[PDB]
Amino acid sequence: VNLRSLLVNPEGPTLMRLNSVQSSERPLFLVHPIEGSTTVFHSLASRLSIPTYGLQCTRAAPLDSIHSLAAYYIDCIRQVQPEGPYRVAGYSYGACVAFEMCSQLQAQHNSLFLFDGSPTYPGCEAEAETEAICFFVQQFTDMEHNRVLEALLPLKGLEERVAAAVDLIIKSHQGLDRQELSFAARSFYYKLRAAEQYTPKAKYYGNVMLLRAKTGLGADYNLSQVCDGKVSVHVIEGDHRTLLESGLESIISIIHSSLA
């Protein structure tokens, strides 16, 4: 169901075309939410008049930091589009990565769309990993925090937690690929770490557009804290998850009307 769309093929391609659009215009690149899949971008892409791609997080992506992750996604991009003027958007967690990407392209005139997300929106390894994976577990099962927390806290480290987690999950959905869950659970922790440890290097002088959800740091998601250029935020109908589904019509118009 909704759960298999929280998993990605660890060996799948990083950059995948999301719609037919044979056009010759510069494409629009969509950066995945924290779960790594470009599934949420399916509706939006199908209803877009420009070629749009998706970036998913597979085993090939370096997660030591948002900086590395962005530099790698930039490389995947330059294969489909070698030239400078880039159009990139990032959903939720992807927002931050998309920001770092355009940010690196700057230091090295691009369009940047943030779908309800932003760069904002050492001895405690154990608790961090436990809470991360504990959370991850709750997305696939019903298990109570405390019961799950009790099973993951005393474990040696990440791989034991991931394994114990994958077991708890399968004991609820036997059909889920254990290799995917295992990769999902582990990268999930690494993605959180990289994000909750990210802080823009310099100020972004480029034009940013925040498409915020209507139903819920102040209608800016702290964008102004890191941007100098034009920061325009549109309020879309729905909450964090429904926004791209019709808050989608609004978004489709806004994106269309922007990119000439």
Side-chain angles (χ1 to χ4, degrees), residues 24-29 51 77-78 80-88 102 105-106 109-112 204 259:
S24 57
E25 299 166 286
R26 300 172 311 188
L28 174 68
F29 304 99
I77 274 185
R78 294 186 171 302
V80 153
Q81 186 194 315
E83 282 72 60
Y86 294 108
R87 306 163 160 183
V88 34
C102 296
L105 290 175
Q106 187 183 77
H109 58 297
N110 302 293
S111 301
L112 168 61
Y204 194 58
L259 312 172

mmCIF file with all atom_site columns, all heavy atoms in Angstrom, residues 24-29 51 77-78 80-88 102 105-106 109-112 204 259:
data_model
loop_
_atom_site.group_PDB
_atom_site.id
_atom_site.type_symbol
_atom_site.label_atom_id
_atom_site.label_alt_id
_atom_site.label_comp_id
_atom_site.label_asym_id
_atom_site.label_entity_id
_atom_site.label_seq_id
_atom_site.pdbx_PDB_ins_code
_atom_site.Cartn_x
_atom_site.Cartn_y
_atom_site.Cartn_z
_atom_site.occupancy
_atom_site.B_iso_or_equiv
_atom_site.pdbx_formal_charge
_atom_site.auth_seq_id
_atom_site.auth_comp_id
_atom_site.auth_asym_id
_atom_site.auth_atom_id
_atom_site.pdbx_PDB_model_num
ATOM 1   N N   . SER A 1 24  ? 11.672 20.723 -25.371 1.00 0.00 ? 24  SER A N   1
ATOM 2   C CA  . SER A 1 24  ? 13.098 20.996 -25.469 1.00 0.00 ? 24  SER A CA  1
ATOM 3   C C   . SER A 1 24  ? 13.518 21.972 -24.376 1.00 0.00 ? 24  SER A C   1
ATOM 4   O O   . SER A 1 24  ? 14.673 22.399 -24.314 1.00 0.00 ? 24  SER A O   1
ATOM 5   C CB  . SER A 1 24  ? 13.434 21.576 -26.848 1.00 0.00 ? 24  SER A CB  1
ATOM 6   O OG  . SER A 1 24  ? 12.689 22.755 -27.115 1.00 0.00 ? 24  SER A OG  1
ATOM 7   N N   . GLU A 1 25  ? 12.568 22.320 -23.516 1.00 0.00 ? 25  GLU A N   1
ATOM 8   C CA  . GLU A 1 25  ? 12.819 23.241 -22.411 1.00 0.00 ? 25  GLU A CA  1
ATOM 9   C C   . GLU A 1 25  ? 13.720 22.609 -21.352 1.00 0.00 ? 25  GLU A C   1
ATOM 10  O O   . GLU A 1 25  ? 13.879 21.385 -21.306 1.00 0.00 ? 25  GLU A O   1
ATOM 11  C CB  . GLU A 1 25  ? 11.501 23.628 -21.748 1.00 0.00 ? 25  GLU A CB  1
ATOM 12  C CG  . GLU A 1 25  ? 10.515 24.335 -22.645 1.00 0.00 ? 25  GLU A CG  1
ATOM 13  C CD  . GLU A 1 25  ? 9.129  24.379 -22.035 1.00 0.00 ? 25  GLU A CD  1
ATOM 14  O OE1 . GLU A 1 25  ? 8.451  23.325 -22.018 1.00 0.00 ? 25  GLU A OE1 1
ATOM 15  O OE2 . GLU A 1 25  ? 8.722  25.462 -21.559 1.00 0.00 ? 25  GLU A OE2 1
ATOM 16  N N   . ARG A 1 26  ? 14.308 23.450 -20.502 1.00 0.00 ? 26  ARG A N   1
ATOM 17  C CA  . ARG A 1 26  ? 15.157 22.963 -19.422 1.00 0.00 ? 26  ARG A CA  1
ATOM 18  C C   . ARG A 1 26  ? 14.235 22.190 -18.476 1.00 0.00 ? 26  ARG A C   1
ATOM 19  O O   . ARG A 1 26  ? 13.147 22.663 -18.129 1.00 0.00 ? 26  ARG A O   1
ATOM 20  C CB  . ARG A 1 26  ? 15.793 24.125 -18.663 1.00 0.00 ? 26  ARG A CB  1
ATOM 21  C CG  . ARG A 1 26  ? 16.672 25.032 -19.494 1.00 0.00 ? 26  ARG A CG  1
ATOM 22  C CD  . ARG A 1 26  ? 17.084 26.246 -18.668 1.00 0.00 ? 26  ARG A CD  1
ATOM 23  N NE  . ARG A 1 26  ? 15.921 26.851 -18.017 1.00 0.00 ? 26  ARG A NE  1
ATOM 24  C CZ  . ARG A 1 26  ? 15.930 28.008 -17.361 1.00 0.00 ? 26  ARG A CZ  1
ATOM 25  N NH1 . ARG A 1 26  ? 17.048 28.715 -17.255 1.00 0.00 ? 26  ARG A NH1 1
ATOM 26  N NH2 . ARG A 1 26  ? 14.811 28.460 -16.810 1.00 0.00 ? 26  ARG A NH2 1
ATOM 27  N N   . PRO A 1 27  ? 14.658 20.993 -18.040 1.00 0.00 ? 27  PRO A N   1
ATOM 28  C CA  . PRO A 1 27  ? 13.810 20.208 -17.139 1.00 0.00 ? 27  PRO A CA  1
ATOM 29  C C   . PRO A 1 27  ? 13.721 20.742 -15.716 1.00 0.00 ? 27  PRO A C   1
ATOM 30  O O   . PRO A 1 27  ? 14.479 21.625 -15.302 1.00 0.00 ? 27  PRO A O   1
ATOM 31  C CB  . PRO A 1 27  ? 14.455 18.817 -17.170 1.00 0.00 ? 27  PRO A CB  1
ATOM 32  C CG  . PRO A 1 27  ? 15.279 18.822 -18.440 1.00 0.00 ? 27  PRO A CG  1
ATOM 33  C CD  . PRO A 1 27  ? 15.836 20.214 -18.449 1.00 0.00 ? 27  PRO A CD  1
ATOM 34  N N   . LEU A 1 28  ? 12.773 20.185 -14.980 1.00 0.00 ? 28  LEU A N   1
ATOM 35  C CA  . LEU A 1 28  ? 12.555 20.524 -13.587 1.00 0.00 ? 28  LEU A CA  1
ATOM 36  C C   . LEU A 1 28  ? 12.924 19.262 -12.793 1.00 0.00 ? 28  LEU A C   1
ATOM 37  O O   . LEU A 1 28  ? 12.380 18.184 -13.037 1.00 0.00 ? 28  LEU A O   1
ATOM 38  C CB  . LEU A 1 28  ? 11.087 20.872 -13.340 1.00 0.00 ? 28  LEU A CB  1
ATOM 39  C CG  . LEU A 1 28  ? 10.733 21.095 -11.871 1.00 0.00 ? 28  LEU A CG  1
ATOM 40  C CD1 . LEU A 1 28  ? 11.402 22.368 -11.383 1.00 0.00 ? 28  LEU A CD1 1
ATOM 41  C CD2 . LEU A 1 28  ? 9.219  21.170 -11.703 1.00 0.00 ? 28  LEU A CD2 1
ATOM 42  N N   . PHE A 1 29  ? 13.847 19.401 -11.849 1.00 0.00 ? 29  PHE A N   1
ATOM 43  C CA  . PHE A 1 29  ? 14.279 18.273 -11.030 1.00 0.00 ? 29  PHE A CA  1
ATOM 44  C C   . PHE A 1 29  ? 13.625 18.271 -9.639  1.00 0.00 ? 29  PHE A C   1
ATOM 45  O O   . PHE A 1 29  ? 13.705 19.245 -8.884  1.00 0.00 ? 29  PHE A O   1
ATOM 46  C CB  . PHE A 1 29  ? 15.801 18.295 -10.925 1.00 0.00 ? 29  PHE A CB  1
ATOM 47  C CG  . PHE A 1 29  ? 16.493 18.277 -12.261 1.00 0.00 ? 29  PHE A CG  1
ATOM 48  C CD1 . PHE A 1 29  ? 16.964 19.462 -12.830 1.00 0.00 ? 29  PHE A CD1 1
ATOM 49  C CD2 . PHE A 1 29  ? 16.662 17.073 -12.961 1.00 0.00 ? 29  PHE A CD2 1
ATOM 50  C CE1 . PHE A 1 29  ? 17.602 19.456 -14.079 1.00 0.00 ? 29  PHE A CE1 1
ATOM 51  C CE2 . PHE A 1 29  ? 17.295 17.048 -14.215 1.00 0.00 ? 29  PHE A CE2 1
ATOM 52  C CZ  . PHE A 1 29  ? 17.769 18.243 -14.777 1.00 0.00 ? 29  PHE A CZ  1
ATOM 53  N N   . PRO A 1 51  ? 9.593  18.917 -19.224 1.00 0.00 ? 51  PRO A N   1
ATOM 54  C CA  . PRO A 1 51  ? 10.165 17.630 -18.818 1.00 0.00 ? 51  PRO A CA  1
ATOM 55  C C   . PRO A 1 51  ? 10.572 17.687 -17.339 1.00 0.00 ? 51  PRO A C   1
ATOM 56  O O   . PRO A 1 51  ? 11.340 18.558 -16.930 1.00 0.00 ? 51  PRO A O   1
ATOM 57  C CB  . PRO A 1 51  ? 11.365 17.472 -19.761 1.00 0.00 ? 51  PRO A CB  1
ATOM 58  C CG  . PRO A 1 51  ? 11.774 18.886 -20.036 1.00 0.00 ? 51  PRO A CG  1
ATOM 59  C CD  . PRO A 1 51  ? 10.443 19.581 -20.232 1.00 0.00 ? 51  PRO A CD  1
ATOM 60  N N   . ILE A 1 77  ? 22.355 15.337 -12.239 1.00 0.00 ? 77  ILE A N   1
ATOM 61  C CA  . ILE A 1 77  ? 21.664 16.329 -13.053 1.00 0.00 ? 77  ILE A CA  1
ATOM 62  C C   . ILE A 1 77  ? 22.462 16.688 -14.305 1.00 0.00 ? 77  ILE A C   1
ATOM 63  O O   . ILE A 1 77  ? 21.971 16.542 -15.426 1.00 0.00 ? 77  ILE A O   1
ATOM 64  C CB  . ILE A 1 77  ? 21.397 17.622 -12.241 1.00 0.00 ? 77  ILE A CB  1
ATOM 65  C CG1 . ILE A 1 77  ? 20.097 17.480 -11.459 1.00 0.00 ? 77  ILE A CG1 1
ATOM 66  C CG2 . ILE A 1 77  ? 21.329 18.836 -13.158 1.00 0.00 ? 77  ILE A CG2 1
ATOM 67  C CD1 . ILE A 1 77  ? 19.709 18.744 -10.739 1.00 0.00 ? 77  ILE A CD1 1
ATOM 68  N N   . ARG A 1 78  ? 23.695 17.142 -14.115 1.00 0.00 ? 78  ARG A N   1
ATOM 69  C CA  . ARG A 1 78  ? 24.528 17.544 -15.236 1.00 0.00 ? 78  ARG A CA  1
ATOM 70  C C   . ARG A 1 78  ? 24.647 16.523 -16.361 1.00 0.00 ? 78  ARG A C   1
ATOM 71  O O   . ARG A 1 78  ? 25.179 16.838 -17.424 1.00 0.00 ? 78  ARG A O   1
ATOM 72  C CB  . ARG A 1 78  ? 25.916 17.935 -14.743 1.00 0.00 ? 78  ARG A CB  1
ATOM 73  C CG  . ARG A 1 78  ? 25.913 19.174 -13.891 1.00 0.00 ? 78  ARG A CG  1
ATOM 74  C CD  . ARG A 1 78  ? 27.327 19.590 -13.566 1.00 0.00 ? 78  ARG A CD  1
ATOM 75  N NE  . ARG A 1 78  ? 27.394 20.896 -12.914 1.00 0.00 ? 78  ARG A NE  1
ATOM 76  C CZ  . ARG A 1 78  ? 26.927 22.026 -13.442 1.00 0.00 ? 78  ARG A CZ  1
ATOM 77  N NH1 . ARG A 1 78  ? 26.345 22.024 -14.636 1.00 0.00 ? 78  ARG A NH1 1
ATOM 78  N NH2 . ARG A 1 78  ? 27.062 23.172 -12.784 1.00 0.00 ? 78  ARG A NH2 1
ATOM 79  N N   . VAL A 1 80  ? 21.908 14.848 -17.614 1.00 0.00 ? 80  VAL A N   1
ATOM 80  C CA  . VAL A 1 80  ? 20.727 15.087 -18.431 1.00 0.00 ? 80  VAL A CA  1
ATOM 81  C C   . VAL A 1 80  ? 20.768 16.511 -18.975 1.00 0.00 ? 80  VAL A C   1
ATOM 82  O O   . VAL A 1 80  ? 20.335 16.771 -20.092 1.00 0.00 ? 80  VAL A O   1
ATOM 83  C CB  . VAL A 1 80  ? 19.426 14.862 -17.607 1.00 0.00 ? 80  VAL A CB  1
ATOM 84  C CG1 . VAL A 1 80  ? 18.283 15.689 -18.173 1.00 0.00 ? 80  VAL A CG1 1
ATOM 85  C CG2 . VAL A 1 80  ? 19.049 13.371 -17.628 1.00 0.00 ? 80  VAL A CG2 1
ATOM 86  N N   . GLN A 1 81  ? 21.319 17.425 -18.187 1.00 0.00 ? 81  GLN A N   1
ATOM 87  C CA  . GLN A 1 81  ? 21.399 18.814 -18.587 1.00 0.00 ? 81  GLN A CA  1
ATOM 88  C C   . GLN A 1 81  ? 22.738 19.400 -18.181 1.00 0.00 ? 81  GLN A C   1
ATOM 89  O O   . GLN A 1 81  ? 22.901 19.901 -17.067 1.00 0.00 ? 81  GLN A O   1
ATOM 90  C CB  . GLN A 1 81  ? 20.280 19.617 -17.925 1.00 0.00 ? 81  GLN A CB  1
ATOM 91  C CG  . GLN A 1 81  ? 20.194 21.059 -18.407 1.00 0.00 ? 81  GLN A CG  1
ATOM 92  C CD  . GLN A 1 81  ? 19.312 21.922 -17.519 1.00 0.00 ? 81  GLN A CD  1
ATOM 93  O OE1 . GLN A 1 81  ? 18.210 21.519 -17.125 1.00 0.00 ? 81  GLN A OE1 1
ATOM 94  N NE2 . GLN A 1 81  ? 19.791 23.122 -17.206 1.00 0.00 ? 81  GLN A NE2 1
ATOM 95  N N   . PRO A 1 82  ? 23.718 19.357 -19.088 1.00 0.00 ? 82  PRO A N   1
ATOM 96  C CA  . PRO A 1 82  ? 25.064 19.884 -18.835 1.00 0.00 ? 82  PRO A CA  1
ATOM 97  C C   . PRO A 1 82  ? 25.159 21.374 -18.491 1.00 0.00 ? 82  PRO A C   1
ATOM 98  O O   . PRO A 1 82  ? 26.047 21.774 -17.745 1.00 0.00 ? 82  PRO A O   1
ATOM 99  C CB  . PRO A 1 82  ? 25.804 19.570 -20.131 1.00 0.00 ? 82  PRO A CB  1
ATOM 100 C CG  . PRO A 1 82  ? 25.098 18.353 -20.648 1.00 0.00 ? 82  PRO A CG  1
ATOM 101 C CD  . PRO A 1 82  ? 23.655 18.663 -20.387 1.00 0.00 ? 82  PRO A CD  1
ATOM 102 N N   . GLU A 1 83  ? 24.248 22.190 -19.021 1.00 0.00 ? 83  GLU A N   1
ATOM 103 C CA  . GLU A 1 83  ? 24.314 23.636 -18.806 1.00 0.00 ? 83  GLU A CA  1
ATOM 104 C C   . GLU A 1 83  ? 23.665 24.295 -17.587 1.00 0.00 ? 83  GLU A C   1
ATOM 105 O O   . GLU A 1 83  ? 22.559 23.955 -17.177 1.00 0.00 ? 83  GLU A O   1
ATOM 106 C CB  . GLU A 1 83  ? 23.849 24.361 -20.072 1.00 0.00 ? 83  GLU A CB  1
ATOM 107 C CG  . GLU A 1 83  ? 24.903 24.422 -21.188 1.00 0.00 ? 83  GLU A CG  1
ATOM 108 C CD  . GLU A 1 83  ? 25.155 23.083 -21.862 1.00 0.00 ? 83  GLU A CD  1
ATOM 109 O OE1 . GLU A 1 83  ? 24.198 22.516 -22.431 1.00 0.00 ? 83  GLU A OE1 1
ATOM 110 O OE2 . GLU A 1 83  ? 26.308 22.603 -21.829 1.00 0.00 ? 83  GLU A OE2 1
ATOM 111 N N   . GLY A 1 84  ? 24.390 25.285 -17.067 1.00 0.00 ? 84  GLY A N   1
ATOM 112 C CA  . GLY A 1 84  ? 24.028 26.067 -15.890 1.00 0.00 ? 84  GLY A CA  1
ATOM 113 C C   . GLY A 1 84  ? 22.632 26.460 -15.412 1.00 0.00 ? 84  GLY A C   1
ATOM 114 O O   . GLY A 1 84  ? 22.302 26.173 -14.262 1.00 0.00 ? 84  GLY A O   1
ATOM 115 N N   . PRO A 1 85  ? 21.795 27.129 -16.220 1.00 0.00 ? 85  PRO A N   1
ATOM 116 C CA  . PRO A 1 85  ? 20.466 27.491 -15.702 1.00 0.00 ? 85  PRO A CA  1
ATOM 117 C C   . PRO A 1 85  ? 19.611 26.281 -15.288 1.00 0.00 ? 85  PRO A C   1
ATOM 118 O O   . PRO A 1 85  ? 19.029 25.601 -16.141 1.00 0.00 ? 85  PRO A O   1
ATOM 119 C CB  . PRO A 1 85  ? 19.859 28.276 -16.860 1.00 0.00 ? 85  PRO A CB  1
ATOM 120 C CG  . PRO A 1 85  ? 20.439 27.578 -18.056 1.00 0.00 ? 85  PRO A CG  1
ATOM 121 C CD  . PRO A 1 85  ? 21.892 27.401 -17.665 1.00 0.00 ? 85  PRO A CD  1
ATOM 122 N N   . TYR A 1 86  ? 19.524 26.024 -13.979 1.00 0.00 ? 86  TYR A N   1
ATOM 123 C CA  . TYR A 1 86  ? 18.761 24.877 -13.484 1.00 0.00 ? 86  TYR A CA  1
ATOM 124 C C   . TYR A 1 86  ? 17.484 25.169 -12.717 1.00 0.00 ? 86  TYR A C   1
ATOM 125 O O   . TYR A 1 86  ? 17.388 26.141 -11.973 1.00 0.00 ? 86  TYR A O   1
ATOM 126 C CB  . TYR A 1 86  ? 19.645 23.989 -12.614 1.00 0.00 ? 86  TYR A CB  1
ATOM 127 C CG  . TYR A 1 86  ? 20.768 23.321 -13.362 1.00 0.00 ? 86  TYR A CG  1
ATOM 128 C CD1 . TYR A 1 86  ? 22.087 23.736 -13.187 1.00 0.00 ? 86  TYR A CD1 1
ATOM 129 C CD2 . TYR A 1 86  ? 20.515 22.279 -14.259 1.00 0.00 ? 86  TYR A CD2 1
ATOM 130 C CE1 . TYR A 1 86  ? 23.124 23.140 -13.881 1.00 0.00 ? 86  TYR A CE1 1
ATOM 131 C CE2 . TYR A 1 86  ? 21.552 21.672 -14.960 1.00 0.00 ? 86  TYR A CE2 1
ATOM 132 C CZ  . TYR A 1 86  ? 22.854 22.112 -14.765 1.00 0.00 ? 86  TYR A CZ  1
ATOM 133 O OH  . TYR A 1 86  ? 23.888 21.531 -15.455 1.00 0.00 ? 86  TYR A OH  1
ATOM 134 N N   . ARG A 1 87  ? 16.510 24.285 -12.893 1.00 0.00 ? 87  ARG A N   1
ATOM 135 C CA  . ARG A 1 87  ? 15.213 24.392 -12.229 1.00 0.00 ? 87  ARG A CA  1
ATOM 136 C C   . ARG A 1 87  ? 15.084 23.199 -11.300 1.00 0.00 ? 87  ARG A C   1
ATOM 137 O O   . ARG A 1 87  ? 14.916 22.064 -11.752 1.00 0.00 ? 87  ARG A O   1
ATOM 138 C CB  . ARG A 1 87  ? 14.076 24.338 -13.246 1.00 0.00 ? 87  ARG A CB  1
ATOM 139 C CG  . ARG A 1 87  ? 14.180 25.355 -14.362 1.00 0.00 ? 87  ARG A CG  1
ATOM 140 C CD  . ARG A 1 87  ? 13.267 24.954 -15.491 1.00 0.00 ? 87  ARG A CD  1
ATOM 141 N NE  . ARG A 1 87  ? 12.948 26.077 -16.361 1.00 0.00 ? 87  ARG A NE  1
ATOM 142 C CZ  . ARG A 1 87  ? 12.114 25.999 -17.388 1.00 0.00 ? 87  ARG A CZ  1
ATOM 143 N NH1 . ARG A 1 87  ? 11.517 24.848 -17.671 1.00 0.00 ? 87  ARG A NH1 1
ATOM 144 N NH2 . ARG A 1 87  ? 11.870 27.071 -18.130 1.00 0.00 ? 87  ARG A NH2 1
ATOM 145 N N   . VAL A 1 88  ? 15.151 23.465 -10.001 1.00 0.00 ? 88  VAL A N   1
ATOM 146 C CA  . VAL A 1 88  ? 15.065 22.405 -9.018  1.00 0.00 ? 88  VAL A CA  1
ATOM 147 C C   . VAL A 1 88  ? 14.120 22.704 -7.854  1.00 0.00 ? 88  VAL A C   1
ATOM 148 O O   . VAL A 1 88  ? 14.088 23.813 -7.324  1.00 0.00 ? 88  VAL A O   1
ATOM 149 C CB  . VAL A 1 88  ? 16.476 22.073 -8.479  1.00 0.00 ? 88  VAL A CB  1
ATOM 150 C CG1 . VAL A 1 88  ? 17.301 23.326 -8.438  1.00 0.00 ? 88  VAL A CG1 1
ATOM 151 C CG2 . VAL A 1 88  ? 16.390 21.450 -7.084  1.00 0.00 ? 88  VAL A CG2 1
ATOM 152 N N   . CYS A 1 102 ? 21.280 24.267 -5.195  1.00 0.00 ? 102 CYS A N   1
ATOM 153 C CA  . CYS A 1 102 ? 21.310 25.577 -5.851  1.00 0.00 ? 102 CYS A CA  1
ATOM 154 C C   . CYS A 1 102 ? 22.336 26.431 -5.162  1.00 0.00 ? 102 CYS A C   1
ATOM 155 O O   . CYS A 1 102 ? 22.951 27.296 -5.774  1.00 0.00 ? 102 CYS A O   1
ATOM 156 C CB  . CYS A 1 102 ? 19.957 26.261 -5.750  1.00 0.00 ? 102 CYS A CB  1
ATOM 157 S SG  . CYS A 1 102 ? 18.670 25.388 -6.607  1.00 0.00 ? 102 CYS A SG  1
ATOM 158 N N   . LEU A 1 105 ? 25.611 25.442 -6.632  1.00 0.00 ? 105 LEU A N   1
ATOM 159 C CA  . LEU A 1 105 ? 25.671 25.915 -8.014  1.00 0.00 ? 105 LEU A CA  1
ATOM 160 C C   . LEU A 1 105 ? 25.991 27.411 -8.003  1.00 0.00 ? 105 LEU A C   1
ATOM 161 O O   . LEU A 1 105 ? 26.629 27.925 -8.923  1.00 0.00 ? 105 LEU A O   1
ATOM 162 C CB  . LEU A 1 105 ? 24.335 25.702 -8.727  1.00 0.00 ? 105 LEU A CB  1
ATOM 163 C CG  . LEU A 1 105 ? 23.882 24.283 -9.063  1.00 0.00 ? 105 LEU A CG  1
ATOM 164 C CD1 . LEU A 1 105 ? 22.474 24.353 -9.646  1.00 0.00 ? 105 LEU A CD1 1
ATOM 165 C CD2 . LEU A 1 105 ? 24.847 23.629 -10.053 1.00 0.00 ? 105 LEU A CD2 1
ATOM 166 N N   . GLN A 1 106 ? 25.531 28.097 -6.955  1.00 0.00 ? 106 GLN A N   1
ATOM 167 C CA  . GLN A 1 106 ? 25.757 29.528 -6.786  1.00 0.00 ? 106 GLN A CA  1
ATOM 168 C C   . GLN A 1 106 ? 27.252 29.767 -6.578  1.00 0.00 ? 106 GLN A C   1
ATOM 169 O O   . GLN A 1 106 ? 27.906 30.411 -7.395  1.00 0.00 ? 106 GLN A O   1
ATOM 170 C CB  . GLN A 1 106 ? 24.968 30.051 -5.572  1.00 0.00 ? 106 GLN A CB  1
ATOM 171 C CG  . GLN A 1 106 ? 24.987 31.571 -5.403  1.00 0.00 ? 106 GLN A CG  1
ATOM 172 C CD  . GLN A 1 106 ? 24.259 32.055 -4.148  1.00 0.00 ? 106 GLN A CD  1
ATOM 173 O OE1 . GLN A 1 106 ? 24.779 31.962 -3.033  1.00 0.00 ? 106 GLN A OE1 1
ATOM 174 N NE2 . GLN A 1 106 ? 23.045 32.571 -4.330  1.00 0.00 ? 106 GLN A NE2 1
ATOM 175 N N   . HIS A 1 109 ? 20.980 32.469 -10.732 1.00 0.00 ? 109 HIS A N   1
ATOM 176 C CA  . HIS A 1 109 ? 20.009 32.569 -11.818 1.00 0.00 ? 109 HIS A CA  1
ATOM 177 C C   . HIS A 1 109 ? 19.226 31.261 -11.997 1.00 0.00 ? 109 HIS A C   1
ATOM 178 O O   . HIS A 1 109 ? 18.669 31.010 -13.067 1.00 0.00 ? 109 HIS A O   1
ATOM 179 C CB  . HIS A 1 109 ? 20.729 32.906 -13.117 1.00 0.00 ? 109 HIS A CB  1
ATOM 180 C CG  . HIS A 1 109 ? 21.780 31.910 -13.484 1.00 0.00 ? 109 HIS A CG  1
ATOM 181 N ND1 . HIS A 1 109 ? 22.887 31.677 -12.698 1.00 0.00 ? 109 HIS A ND1 1
ATOM 182 C CD2 . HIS A 1 109 ? 21.872 31.052 -14.529 1.00 0.00 ? 109 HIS A CD2 1
ATOM 183 C CE1 . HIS A 1 109 ? 23.617 30.719 -13.241 1.00 0.00 ? 109 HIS A CE1 1
ATOM 184 N NE2 . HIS A 1 109 ? 23.023 30.322 -14.353 1.00 0.00 ? 109 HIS A NE2 1
ATOM 185 N N   . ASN A 1 110 ? 19.195 30.434 -10.951 1.00 0.00 ? 110 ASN A N   1
ATOM 186 C CA  . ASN A 1 110 ? 18.484 29.153 -10.982 1.00 0.00 ? 110 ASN A CA  1
ATOM 187 C C   . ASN A 1 110 ? 17.144 29.283 -10.272 1.00 0.00 ? 110 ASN A C   1
ATOM 188 O O   . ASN A 1 110 ? 16.986 30.116 -9.376  1.00 0.00 ? 110 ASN A O   1
ATOM 189 C CB  . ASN A 1 110 ? 19.276 28.053 -10.256 1.00 0.00 ? 110 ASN A CB  1
ATOM 190 C CG  . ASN A 1 110 ? 20.654 27.832 -10.834 1.00 0.00 ? 110 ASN A CG  1
ATOM 191 O OD1 . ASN A 1 110 ? 20.803 27.370 -11.967 1.00 0.00 ? 110 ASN A OD1 1
ATOM 192 N ND2 . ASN A 1 110 ? 21.674 28.158 -10.053 1.00 0.00 ? 110 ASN A ND2 1
ATOM 193 N N   . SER A 1 111 ? 16.189 28.446 -10.659 1.00 0.00 ? 111 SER A N   1
ATOM 194 C CA  . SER A 1 111 ? 14.878 28.451 -10.022 1.00 0.00 ? 111 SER A CA  1
ATOM 195 C C   . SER A 1 111 ? 14.893 27.441 -8.869  1.00 0.00 ? 111 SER A C   1
ATOM 196 O O   . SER A 1 111 ? 15.381 26.318 -9.023  1.00 0.00 ? 111 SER A O   1
ATOM 197 C CB  . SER A 1 111 ? 13.790 28.065 -11.023 1.00 0.00 ? 111 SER A CB  1
ATOM 198 O OG  . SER A 1 111 ? 13.771 28.962 -12.111 1.00 0.00 ? 111 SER A OG  1
ATOM 199 N N   . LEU A 1 112 ? 14.364 27.839 -7.720  1.00 0.00 ? 112 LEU A N   1
ATOM 200 C CA  . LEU A 1 112 ? 14.327 26.966 -6.561  1.00 0.00 ? 112 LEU A CA  1
ATOM 201 C C   . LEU A 1 112 ? 12.939 26.948 -5.916  1.00 0.00 ? 112 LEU A C   1
ATOM 202 O O   . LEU A 1 112 ? 12.497 27.947 -5.367  1.00 0.00 ? 112 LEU A O   1
ATOM 203 C CB  . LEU A 1 112 ? 15.373 27.423 -5.535  1.00 0.00 ? 112 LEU A CB  1
ATOM 204 C CG  . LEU A 1 112 ? 15.290 26.791 -4.135  1.00 0.00 ? 112 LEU A CG  1
ATOM 205 C CD1 . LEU A 1 112 ? 15.481 25.293 -4.266  1.00 0.00 ? 112 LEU A CD1 1
ATOM 206 C CD2 . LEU A 1 112 ? 16.338 27.390 -3.196  1.00 0.00 ? 112 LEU A CD2 1
ATOM 207 N N   . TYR A 1 204 ? 22.085 32.770 0.283   1.00 0.00 ? 204 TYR A N   1
ATOM 208 C CA  . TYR A 1 204 ? 21.632 32.520 -1.074  1.00 0.00 ? 204 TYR A CA  1
ATOM 209 C C   . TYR A 1 204 ? 21.046 33.817 -1.622  1.00 0.00 ? 204 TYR A C   1
ATOM 210 O O   . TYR A 1 204 ? 20.094 34.367 -1.063  1.00 0.00 ? 204 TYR A O   1
ATOM 211 C CB  . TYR A 1 204 ? 20.576 31.402 -1.093  1.00 0.00 ? 204 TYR A CB  1
ATOM 212 C CG  . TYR A 1 204 ? 20.309 30.859 -2.476  1.00 0.00 ? 204 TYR A CG  1
ATOM 213 C CD1 . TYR A 1 204 ? 21.339 30.310 -3.229  1.00 0.00 ? 204 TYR A CD1 1
ATOM 214 C CD2 . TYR A 1 204 ? 19.039 30.920 -3.045  1.00 0.00 ? 204 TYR A CD2 1
ATOM 215 C CE1 . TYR A 1 204 ? 21.117 29.837 -4.518  1.00 0.00 ? 204 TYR A CE1 1
ATOM 216 C CE2 . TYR A 1 204 ? 18.802 30.444 -4.343  1.00 0.00 ? 204 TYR A CE2 1
ATOM 217 C CZ  . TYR A 1 204 ? 19.846 29.906 -5.073  1.00 0.00 ? 204 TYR A CZ  1
ATOM 218 O OH  . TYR A 1 204 ? 19.630 29.453 -6.362  1.00 0.00 ? 204 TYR A OH  1
ATOM 219 N N   . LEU A 1 259 ? 8.462  29.495 -14.328 1.00 0.00 ? 259 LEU A N   1
ATOM 220 C CA  . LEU A 1 259 ? 9.274  29.029 -15.445 1.00 0.00 ? 259 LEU A CA  1
ATOM 221 C C   . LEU A 1 259 ? 8.607  29.433 -16.758 1.00 0.00 ? 259 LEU A C   1
ATOM 222 O O   . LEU A 1 259 ? 7.737  28.719 -17.263 1.00 0.00 ? 259 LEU A O   1
ATOM 223 C CB  . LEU A 1 259 ? 9.402  27.508 -15.373 1.00 0.00 ? 259 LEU A CB  1
ATOM 224 C CG  . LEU A 1 259 ? 9.777  26.988 -13.981 1.00 0.00 ? 259 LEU A CG  1
ATOM 225 C CD1 . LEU A 1 259 ? 9.690  25.472 -13.950 1.00 0.00 ? 259 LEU A CD1 1
ATOM 226 C CD2 . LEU A 1 259 ? 11.177 27.467 -13.619 1.00 0.00 ? 259 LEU A CD2 1
#
